[PDB]
Amino acid sequence: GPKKSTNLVKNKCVNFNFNGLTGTGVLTESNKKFLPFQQFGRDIADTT
Amino acid sequence: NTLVKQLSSKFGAISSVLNDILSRLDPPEAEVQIDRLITGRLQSLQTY
């Protein structure tokens, strides 16, 4: 839909909405070698 | 591990994510959508 994008906040607890994925947490940068078709990331027990 | 895996079930609901259900429907049947999740999670906790 027509919603306003917000600039990147990092290393703080924040609500986040990435393409309708609503969540709450802290953002950081990581050395995860994502393949070009790979979009999301998961681990044990299928948590984002 | 089994508790954390079981946290991501549906128990007869339309989705396994509370925020996905809450942003999808209006309250007066979102509450009966989430009541089944409540029953399943209490049963899981009592078993554990």
Partner: peptide, 28 residues
């Protein structure tokens, strides 16, 4: 610790810690 206790500690092996963030805590 004695060599026996060191061997027993090394023999028993104690991402999985980050998944216990849904109200689950392990007290020391």
């Amino acid at each position: 610790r004695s060599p026996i206790e060191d061997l027993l500690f090394n023999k028993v092996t104690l991402l999985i810690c980050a998944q216990k963030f849904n109200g689950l805590t392990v007290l020391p």
